[PDB]
Amino acid sequence: TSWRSEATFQFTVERFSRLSESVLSPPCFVRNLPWKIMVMPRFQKSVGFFLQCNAESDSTSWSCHAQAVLKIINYRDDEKSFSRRISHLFFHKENDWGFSNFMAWSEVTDPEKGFIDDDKVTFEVFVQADAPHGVAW
């Protein structure tokens, strides 16, 4: 259910080589809160990859600590998939966390590397969140 303490979800970004604006995935519910993958180009140059939590809510009382593994899937060999982990206390003033320089843009878009196919790149997040505070009183 949506109350699950952890989950793994993916978001495939299309026309990747042409990415210009920040893109946001649909929400995945963990601890009954909406978690999303955020991707953006940073300086073409590098891949910005972040995990967002409960950003739409106008509440300023909530907080949720979580650990997560942010991964860019290598479709040719999952052992070649690239991942980094984070630990962050999410709340209204700091609702996302990740890496602005997660991977070199030239590497992810290199057709010989196995991360891109038909100009599509798949992002994955495995999030393990603690019980939230200031939400479900």
Binding site: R84, I86, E94, D96, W97, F99, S100, N101
Partner: peptide, 8 residues
Amino acid sequence: DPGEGPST
């Protein structure tokens, strides 16, 4: 470094 931190 990978530039860990908020999207901003």
